[PDB]
Structure formats: C-alpha cells, structure tokens
Amino acid sequence: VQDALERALPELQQALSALKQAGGARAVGAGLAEVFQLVEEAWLLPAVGREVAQGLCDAIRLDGGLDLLLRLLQAPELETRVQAARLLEQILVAENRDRVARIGLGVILNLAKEREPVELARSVAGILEHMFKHSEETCQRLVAAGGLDAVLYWCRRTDPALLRHCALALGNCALHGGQAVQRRMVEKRAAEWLFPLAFSKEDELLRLHACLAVAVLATNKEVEREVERSGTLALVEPLVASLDPGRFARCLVDASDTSQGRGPDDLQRLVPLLDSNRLEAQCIGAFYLCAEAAIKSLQGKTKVFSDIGAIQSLKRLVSYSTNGTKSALAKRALRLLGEEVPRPILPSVPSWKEAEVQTWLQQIGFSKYCESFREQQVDGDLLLRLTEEELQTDLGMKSGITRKRFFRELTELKTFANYSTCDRSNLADWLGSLDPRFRQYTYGLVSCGLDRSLLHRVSEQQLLEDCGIHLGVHRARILTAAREML
Amino acid sequence: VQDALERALPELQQALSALKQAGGARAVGAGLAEVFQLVEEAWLLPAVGREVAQGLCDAIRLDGGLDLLLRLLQAPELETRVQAARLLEQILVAENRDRVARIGLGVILNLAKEREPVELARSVAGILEHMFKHSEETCQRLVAAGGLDAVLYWCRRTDPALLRHCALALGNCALHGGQAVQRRMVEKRAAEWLFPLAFSKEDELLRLHACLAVAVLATNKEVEREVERSGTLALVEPLVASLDPGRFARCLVDASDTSQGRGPDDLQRLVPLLDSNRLEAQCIGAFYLCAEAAIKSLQGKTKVFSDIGAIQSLKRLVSYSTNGTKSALAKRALRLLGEEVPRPILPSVPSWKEAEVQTWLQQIGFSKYCESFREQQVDGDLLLRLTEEELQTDLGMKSGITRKRFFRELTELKTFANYSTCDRSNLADWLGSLDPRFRQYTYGLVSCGLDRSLLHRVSEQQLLEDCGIHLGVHRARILTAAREML
Numbered sequence: 005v006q007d008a009l010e011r012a013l014p015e016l017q018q019a020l021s022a023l024k025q026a027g028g029a030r031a032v033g034a035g036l037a038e039v040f041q042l043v044e045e046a047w048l049l050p051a052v053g054r055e056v057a058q059g060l061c062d063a064i065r066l067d068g069g070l071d072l073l074l075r076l077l078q079a080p081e082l083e084t085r086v087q088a089a090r091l092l093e094q095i096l097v098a099e100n101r102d103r104v105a106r107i108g109l110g111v112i113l114n115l116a117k118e119r120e121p122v123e124l125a126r127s128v129a130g131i132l133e134h135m136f137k138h139s140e141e142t143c144q145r146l147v148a149a150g151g152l153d154a155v156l157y158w159c160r161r162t163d164p165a166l167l168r169h170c171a172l173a174l175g176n177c178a179l180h181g182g183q184a185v186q187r188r189m190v191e192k193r194a195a196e197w198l199f200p201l202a203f204s205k206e207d208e209l210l211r212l213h214a215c216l217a218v219a220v221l222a223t224n225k226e227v228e229r230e231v232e233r234s235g236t237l238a239l240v241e242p243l244v245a246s247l248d249p250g251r252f253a254r255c256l257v258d259a260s261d262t263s264q265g266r267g268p269d270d271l272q273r274l275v276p277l278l279d280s281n282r283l284e285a286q287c288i289g290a291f292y293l294c295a296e297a298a299i300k301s302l303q304g305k306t307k308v309f310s311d312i313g314a315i316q317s318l319k320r321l322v323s324y325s326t327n328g329t330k331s332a333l334a335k336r337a338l339r340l341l342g343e344e345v346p347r348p349i350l351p352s353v354p355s356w357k358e359a360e361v362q363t364w365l366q367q368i369g370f371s372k373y374c375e376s377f378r379e380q381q382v383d384g385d386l387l388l389r390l391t392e393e394e395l396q397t398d399l400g401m402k403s404g405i406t407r408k409r410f411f412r413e414l415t416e417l418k419t420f421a422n423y424s425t426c427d428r429s430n431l432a433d434w435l436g437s438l439d440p441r442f443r444q445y446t447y448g449l450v451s452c453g454l455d456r457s458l459l460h461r462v463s464e465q466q467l468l469e470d471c472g473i474h475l476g477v478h479r480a481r482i483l484t485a486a487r488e489m490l
Numbered sequence: 491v492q493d494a495l496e497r498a499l500p501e502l503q504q505a506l507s508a509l510k511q512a513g514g515a516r517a518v519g520a521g522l523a524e525v526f527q528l529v530e531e532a533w534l535l536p537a538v539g540r541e542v543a544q545g546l547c548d549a550i551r552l553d554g555g556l557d558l559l560l561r562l563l564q565a566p567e568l569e570t571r572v573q574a575a576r577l578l579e580q581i582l583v584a585e586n587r588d589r590v591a592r593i594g595l596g597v598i599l600n601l602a603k604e605r606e607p608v609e610l611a612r613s614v615a616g617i618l619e620h621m622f623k624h625s626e627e628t629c630q631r632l633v634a635a636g637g638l639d640a641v642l643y644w645c646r647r648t649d650p651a652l653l654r655h656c657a658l659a660l661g662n663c664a665l666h667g668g669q670a671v672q673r674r675m676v677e678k679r680a681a682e683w684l685f686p687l688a689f690s691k692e693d694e695l696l697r698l699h700a701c702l703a704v705a706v707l708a709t710n711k712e713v714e715r716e717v718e719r720s721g722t723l724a725l726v727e728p729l730v731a732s733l734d735p736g737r738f739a740r741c742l743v744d745a746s747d748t749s750q751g752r753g754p755d756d757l758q759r760l761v762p763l764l765d766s767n768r769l770e771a772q773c774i775g776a777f778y779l780c781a782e783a784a785i786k787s788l789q790g791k792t793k794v795f796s797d798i799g800a801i802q803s804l805k806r807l808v809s810y811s812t813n814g815t816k817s818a819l820a821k822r823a824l825r826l827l828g829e830e831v832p833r834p835i836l837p838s839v840p841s842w843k844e845a846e847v848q849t850w851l852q853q854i855g856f857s858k859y860c861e862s863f864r865e866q867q868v869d870g871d872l873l874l875r876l877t878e879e880e881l882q883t884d885l886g887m888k889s890g891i892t893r894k895r896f897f898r899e900l901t902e903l904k905t906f907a908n909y910s911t912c913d914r915s916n917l918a919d920w921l922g923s924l925d926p927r928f929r930q931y932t933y934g935l936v937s938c939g940l941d942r943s944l945l946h947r948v949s950e951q952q953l954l955e956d957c958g959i960h961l962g963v964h965r966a967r968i969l970t971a972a973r974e975m976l
C-alpha cells in the first residue's frame with residue numbers, strides 16, 4: 005500500500021525545502037530533526053515499512069537531499085555535523101549508497117579520524133558499517149584508508165551502540181569483502197580484537213555479531229589456523245545451542261535499527277555459510293536464517309527464501325548432517341517456512357541393499373521408477389556405477405531431461421556419501437581438498453585400484469575411460485594435482 | 491498531399507529567378523527574404539510540413555540555388571552575408587548537406603572565424619550543428635579546422651539562441667562523430683565547458699541538450715572517468731525525473747526551428763542509447779524518445795519507431811530494469827505508441843521453479859509448449875542448460891526455425907539474468923567487460939567449476955565441449971582475454 009508513501013512524501017518535500025531555506029544552525033537542526041522523525045516513522049511501520057521507507061530514501065536521493073546532507077556534514081559546527089551523520093546513517097540504501105561511494109567517500113574517511121567524540125563516533129560507525137556492503141573495490145579503498153584501523157580502534161570503548169556497530173561493520177566487510185580483505189584483516193590482527201566482544205556478557209546481540217564475523221573470517225582456509233588459535237572461534241558453537249531463535253527474533257523488532265529485518269541481498273550473503281564446510285559457520289548461518297525466517301513469516305514475505313536458494317540448502321543440511329544443534333536449527337527453520345523436513349539419508353551408500361535404494365528413490369521424487377529399479381536389483385554398488393545407456397535402455401528413462409535430473413540427484417548423493425568401507429587409503433579427503441565437488445569421483449577411482457601412492461602415474465585417457473570422469477576441466481585439474489606428487 | 495507543394499514551387503521558382511536577376515544589395519536582400527518566408531511557411535505546416543519543405547529544398551538544390559547562396563555568402567557585404575547564412579541554416583537537409591560538404595566546406599570554416607558578430611555567429615552555429623551530422627570523416631575534417639574550437643569559444647556568450655545551437659552542435663558531433671572525435675573532444679576539455687550550460691536555469695532546453703551531449707560523450711568508456719569528474723554527468727539523472735515529456739514535447743512545436751520534430755535518421759542515433767550500459771545515458775535516451783513519440787503520435791507517424799528498433803529496446807528496458815525513472819519513461823513511451831507494457835521478469839533465473847518457467851514461456855510467446863515443459867519439469871537449472879537435441883526430441887520443437895527463435899529468446903534471458911546465487915568469484919562481470927554479449931556464458935563456465943583463478947589454464951576443446959561455447963569467434967576472444975592473466 006502506497007497510502008503511507010503518498011501521505012509522507014508531501015511532508016518530506018516540505019521539510020527538504022525548509023532545510024534548503026535554513027540559513028543558520030537552529031533552522032538546520034530543526035529541519036534535520038523533522039526529516040529524521042519522518043523517515044523513522046516509516047522504518048517502524050508494520051509489514052509495509054521497508055517499501056514506504058525506501059520511497060522516502062529515493063526521494064531524498066533526488067531533490068539534492070544527499071548532497072545537502074553531505075555539505076552539512078562538512079559544516080564547521082559539530083552540533084550540525086552530528087545530526088547530519090545521524091540522518092545519513094538511516095538512509096544508506098543501495099541507491100543512496102552508490103552515490104555516496106562515488107561522491108561521499110574520502111570526506112567521511114577524514115571525518116572518521118575524530119576518534120574522540122562519542123556521538124560522532126557512533127554515527128560514523130553506522131556510516132561505515134552500512135558502507136562496507138558495496139562492491140569489493142569499495143572495501144579495498146576503505147581498508148587502504150583509516151576506516152578499518154579506525155573501527156579497530158573504536159572496538160576498545162564501552163558504550164553498547166558503538167561496539168554493536170563496530171561488530172556489524174566487521175561482519176559486513178568480512179562477508180562482502182574479498183579474500184584479500186579477509187587475509188589483510190587477519191594480518192591486521194582483527195581476529196584477536198573480537199575475542200573480548202564474543203566473550204562479553206552485557207548483550208547477546210554483540211556476541212552473536214562477533215561470532216558471525218569470526219566464523220565468516222575462519223571459513224577462509226588460508227587463515228583458518230591462526231584465526232582458530234585466537235580462541236574465539238571455539239566459543240561459537242556453545243553460544244548458538246543455548247540461545248532461542250524466537251527470542252533473538254523477538255528482539256531486532258523492538259529496536260528501530262533493525263525493526264524491519266534483513267534485506268533480500270543480505271540474506272543471499274548468509275546462505276553460503278550453510279555450505280562452508282566449517283561446523284561453526286554452518287551453525288551460525290542456520291541460526292541467523294532461522295531468526296530471519298521467524299521475522300519474515302510474521303511479515304508474510306517467506307517467498308524471498310525460495311528466490312535465494314536457502315530452502316534447498318536447509319533441506320540438504322538436514323539430510324546429510326550428523327551434528328545435533330545445526331540439524332535442529334535447520335529443521336526448525338524449515339518448519340517455520342512451512343516446508344517439509346527430509347528424513348536423514350544413511351551415508352554408507354556402497355553397503356546399500358535394494359530397500360535403501362527404493363527409499364532413496366522415493367525421497368528424491370523418482371517413485372515412478374521404483375518398479376524398474378527393483379526388477380533389475382539395482383543396489384548401492386550398481387547404483388554408484390550407473391551410466392546413461394543403462395538408465396536409457398535397461399531402466400527405461402527415455403527422456404534426456406529426466407536423465408539429467410536423475411544424474412543431478414545422484415551427483416549430490418555421491419558427494420555427500422561415506423566411502424569408509426571402500427577406500428582404506430582415505431582417497432576421498434584428498435579429492436575433497438582440491439574442490440569439494442570432486443569427492444563424487446571417489447568410488448570411480450577406488451574401484452579401479454587407484455590409491456594415493458599410484459595417482460602420479462595415471463593418464464588422462466585412463467581417467468576418461470576407466471574412472472569415468474567426463475568433464476575435461478576436472479580431468480585436467482586432477483592430473484595436475486596428482487603429477488605434483490599429491 | 492502535394493497540393494501545398496504544387497502551390498509553393500511556382501513562387502519559389504519566381505523568387506529564385508528574381509534573386510538571380512538581383513544586381514544589387516537591395517534586390518538580393520528582397521529575394522532572400524522572399525525565399526526565406528516561403529521555406530518557413532512550408533516548415534510550419536501541420537502533418538505534411540516536412541515533405542513539402544523537403545520538396546522546396548530539392549527545388550533549391552537544383553536551379554543553382556545552393557551555389558548562388560554560397561556565392562552571396564562570399565559577398566563582401568556582411569548585410570547580405572547574414573541573410574545568406576540565415577537561409578542556408580534552414581535548408582541543410584541531407585541532400586542539401588552532402589553538396590555543401592563536397593563544395594561549401596572550408597569557406598564556411600573561414601567565415602566562422604568572425605567570432606565577434608552576433609547574427610553571423612548564430613547563423614554559423616546553425617550551419618555547424620546541421621553539418622556535424624555528416625559522415626565521420628566530415629566530422630574529422632571539421633574538428634581539424636577551427637570549427638570545434640570556434641563552437642567551444644562561442645559557448646561562453648549569453649544570447650540564448652547561440653548557446654542552444656552550440657549545445658545542439660556538440661551533441662550532434664558526439665553522436666555522429668567517431669570514437670576518435672569523442673576522445674579528441676575530451677582531450678580538448680569539451681566536457682568541462684558544458685557544465686555551466688547544464689547547471690544554468692534560464693532555459694530547460696539548453697540544459698537538456700547539454701545533458702544529452704555529456705551523456706553521449708560519457709557512454710565511451712575510454713574517457714568515462716574524466717568525463718564523470720567534470721561533475722555535470724551526475725546532474726543528468728535528477729533533471730529528467732522532474733521534467734514532463736509532454737510539456738517538453740509541447741515545446742519544440744511552438745518553435746519554428748523544430749516545429750516538425752526529429753527525423754527518421756536522427757532517432758536511429760538516439761535508440762542505441764537505451765543499450766548504453768550507463769544509467770544516465772539510458773535515462774536521457776528514454777526521455778528524448780518519449781518526447782519524440784509524443785510529437786509523432788500527434789503527427790500520426792508512429793510507424794517510424796518500428797522501423798528503427800525503438801519498440802524492442804523499450805520493451806527490453808521495461809522487462810530487465812530495476813531503476814524507477816527510466817522504467818517510468820519507457821512505460822509511458824510505450825503507452826503513447828499504443829503498444830503493450832511487459833511485466834518485469836525477476837532476474838534470479840538459476841533459482842526458478844516450474845511456475846516461473848511457465849510465466850516466462852507465456853511472456854515470450856511460446857505458450858504452445860507450456861504443457862511439454864511442465865511435463866518434463868524444466869526449471870531454471872534445466873532451462874539454462876537446454877540444447878538442440880533436448881528441444882527437438884524431448885520437448886518437441888521439430889521445426890529448426892522455431893528452435894532458432896527459442897534460442898534467440900533464451901540468449902536474451904541469459905544475458906540479462908542475475909547469477910549472484912551461483913558465481914561467488916563474480917565471473918559474470920569479467921565476461922561482460924570483454925563484450926556484454928558474453929555475459930550469457932556465465933552459467934556455462936560456473937557450472938563447470940571455472941573461476942577467475944582457473945581461466946588461464948583452460949583450452950579451446952574444454953570451452954567447446956564442456957562450457958558449450960559454439961561460435962569460434964567467442965571462444966578465441968575468451969581464450970585470448972584469459973591467457974593475458976585476466
């Protein structure tokens with residue numbers, strides 16, 4: 005409904021005109037307070053708050069509002085500077101951020117150099133946290149300047165809002181920033197600086213943000229060991245298992261800085277954490293996704309989770325996981341969205357009998373082919389070695405699209421299977437080290453007698469014909485990794 | 491209707507004969523005024539104006555009119571010179587344009603060196619603006635002479651007509667002139683001289699012309715950064731969102747110099763702006779096309795927009811855009827033409843389910859194949875990897891022409907899709923940097939595991955068989971770009 009937007013925009017235009025007509029500090033402050041009140045009311049509006057606040061932010065984007073606020077932020081009087089930053093913190097949506105990045109970068113960097121004032125420090129922390137979510141080159145230039153060191157410095161204060169903003173900034177730059185940024189931060193010692201925040205006990209939100217930042221940093225293998233040595237990473241898993249997503253979701257809605265929740269593009273960034281191969285990362289990602297699902301289901305906008313790929317990852321995590329806390333979090337999140345909860349698939353595929361194959365077929369939605377699979381007595385050994393011709397002629401999958409879907413399911417089963425009963429040289433982990441999506445080839449190599457001590461003598465033709473590696477890219481990568489003597 | 495033409499020609503011939511019989515300044519001026527009054531009466535004629543004035547121009551082209559006017563323009567007396575230039579400004583249609591370029595170029599260049607007179611300067615500005623629309627070699631020779639410097643020099647005056655003519659000339663040379671001319675102008679500092687014109691407030695038409703010129707200059711990436719640093723470019727988008735195309739279209743019709751609008755070849759040059767990849771360029775192009783549509787629909791000549799490819803571009807811009815001002819302008823322009831407005835297509839193709847595919851199929855006009863697609867359960871993942879054989883055998887597109895049409899649609903969907911859920915190494919932007927028509931290949935590479943850090947080791951056979959790049963030209967270009975270490 006745009007009725008709130010239609011009502012609010014006249015008032016916003018009048019306030020902007022008055023601010024443009026403000027020739028002194030008093031009028032400037034009055035106009036800034038008026039516009040801040042107008043935008044805050046929209047940000048706290050139930051259900052339609054985001055759209056009817058992005059509308060006013062877009063309006064301010066036009067009419068020269070952003071440039072006027074920046075110029076006021078350059079004003080000699082700090083009393084106006086603080087209010088200008090206060091308003092600039094609550095408007096930096098993507099459309100209002102790209103302009104600031106093109107124009108307003110640098111001036112804010114220099115302004116951040118005043119590390120003494122508390123209100124200015126808080127507002128500037130807001131600006132930086134909301135700015136680190138721009139393209140990775142913006143992160144490069146921000147870290148090159150004193151922004152990263154500045155937030156590093158503010159980390160040692162006590163007022164809660166500044167610490168929470170610093171933690172949010174650290175998480176945002178850990179996520180959006182590139183691998184170089186994360187390595188740079190680790191060399192900056194930023195991982196160790198978060199330990200007091202995570203171990204603190206004043207607020208649970210600050211601890212959650214610190215754990216998120218440290219986990220996202222730890223996902224990167226290049227610096228995983230030193231990050232773990234900080235000791236804060238081990239504090240992640242115990243924290244999530246105790247907190248309740250509903251209570252954590254009940255919060256973030258009584259507050260104003262997050263009353264409306266998390267956007268579609270900030271949820272896209274968290275989804276990969278469910279695929280991070282790191283237990284703490286998956287746990288914290290599942291916790292955050294559960295909280296955001298709790299918020300959005302109340303907002304009645306759960307469709308976003310489908311467009312992001314979160315439901316698929318949650319179902320896969322439920323199926324192919326052995327831990328308890330992350331499985332429970334994923335199951336609760338799936339139930340919140342009103343989606344089904346897959347039953348766990350026992351991982352020892354090579355030791356599967358007919359019944360297991362029938363159950364798996366019924367799970368993946370190929371129940372039309374249960375009779376054909378049962379007639380031919382396809383078991384785990386015969387399933388892991390199935391081919392296109394055997395699918396087409398013997399099992400009866402004539403349509404090539406259906407066969408592609410079946411192989412798409414079987415590749416996920418292969419990647420997330422357990423080959424302990426087959427490979428005694430632990431060849432699955434070596435393949436997973438290069439790229440996790442190479443773990444599907446374990447059974448291909450193992451059944452041919454290959455081991456870690458025989459790989460360096462293999463050839464591309466043997467991999468193509470005997471081990472059944474079809475894609476040339478994977479063949480070349482495996483050969484290059486093997487010819488370096490494992 | 492040629493009745494106006496048939497009436498007008500006898501008078502034009504009598505006036506031309508009288509001018510040829512003019513032996514002094516007074517008779518020359520009288521004949522020039524008569525012919526000027528005649529051509530102007532035709533130019534301001536509703537609906538048929540353009541044709542019945544082009545006929546008078548062809549009449550003048552023959553009978554030695556153009557050579558006579560040029561010789562008068564060489565007359566020692568400036569009183570006759572100004573009128574000769576005044577009449578030469580209003581007759582330079584393409585047929586009358588090429589002749590002057592072959593013959594009358596150079597003399598006009600020298601005459602332009604009279605920077606002091608106001609009337610002569612105005613007429614020369616008109617001549618130069620209407621001449622810069624000749625082949626790019628004519629632009630090269632004009633810039634080599636003092637024409638570009640002369641117009642930049644007149645840009646610093648105040649009389650409105652001269653400034654408007656200079657802005658129009660600069661826009662015309664930016665559009666018709668080659669990339670070398672644009673680079674030359676940027677090095678000439680031509681971008682910066684436009685800032686006062688765009689920031690002016692006396693007339694909105696001058697600001698619009700300056701914004702058009704600067705945007706067309708900025709489309710060229712080689713000089714985009716320095717052009718943006720001028721500061722005028724950022725003033726483009728705020729301007730269009732406030733002006734009304736109808737009022738702007740209502741103007742340019744009360745004026746004689748544009749009473750008839752823009753021609754079929756001056757619109758073909760604006761249409762490429764909708765594909766410029768620059769937000770300001772697309773916004774200004776959409777605004778201009780909307781204004782011209784408003785004019786031509788009143789003239790009842792909207793067919794031209796189909797012959798130019800403007801409707802296809804407008805529909806594509808409406809479908810695959812996220813901005814508000816340009817989308818609104820495109821929708822209004824489409825509605826003026828009496829054409830349909832496509833509903834937006836959500837860009838996250840990889841995350842599509844069956845319903846999204848059915849909607850897309852119904853949009854593109856392949857609703858006859860909805861049942862076949864639904865039966866085979868084609869979704870975004872299977873849609874982005876569809877082939878000729880699967881289309882033919884499994885889905886049932888027997889006619890090769892229909893399959894070519896379908897792939898024509900799918901390639902546009904692929905280029906304008908959002909692969910954020912797939913590519914964490916942001917490989918789409920690298921492909922789009924070489925040529926935007928390569929962004930279609932993103933999902934082809936990504937699904938094979940390739941990244942920016944693995945491209946330099948790929949081979950042509952891998953790009954052909956695995957990544958599915960059929961055209962050899964694109965394969966060679968991609969390999970050459972990758973082997974230079976990204």
Ligand SMILES: NC(=O)c1ccc[n+]([C@@H]2O[C@H](COP(=O)(O)O)[C@@H](O)[C@H]2O)c1
Nearest residue numbers: 047093094095096261262263264265267
């Ligand atoms: N994301 C929210 O729930 C929320 C709530 C209230 C205000 N805001 C403001 O919105 C801006 C950030 O917008 P997005 O992060 O949604 O792009 C900031 O100025 C912030 O202060 C966001």
Ligand SMILES: NC(=O)c1ccc[n+]([C@@H]2O[C@H](COP(=O)(O)O)[C@@H](O)[C@H]2O)c1
Nearest residue numbers: 533579580581582747748749750751753
């Ligand atoms: N394009 C118009 O709407 C228009 C209107 C009146 C006169 N003219 C004259 O026609 C000539 C340009 O012709 P075209 O723009 O059709 O190529 C110039 O001499 C100009 O003064 C053009």
